[PDB]
Amino acid sequence: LAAVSVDCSEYPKDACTLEYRPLCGSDNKTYGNKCNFCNAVVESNGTLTLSHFGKC
Cβ distance 17 to 47 under 8 Å? Predict the structure, then answer.
């Protein structure tokens, strides 16, 4: 059932990516890059999980 996830076990990071990669968290949280998402994960005590890739 779409069991994937991006690396976010090194945040918060003092940088970001220029590339564009839309993600969709389990909370229906759509992000632009794994950078923003990662920040969301760490921000969410690292409880936030990636539901899938690309815009929700």
Answer: no
Breaks (C-N over 2.5 A) in the chain follow: none
DSSP code for 45? T
Residues 41 and 29: their CA atoms lie apart, in Å, by: 11
Determination approach: NMR
Burial of 27-49, coded b for 16+ CB within 10 Å and e otherwise, reads eebebebbbbbbbbbbeeeeebe
Q: Please name which of 11, 46, 49, 10 lies closest in space to residue 31, comparing C-alpha atoms.
A: 49
Q: Which domains does the chain have, with CATH numbers?
A: 1-56 (3.30.60.30)
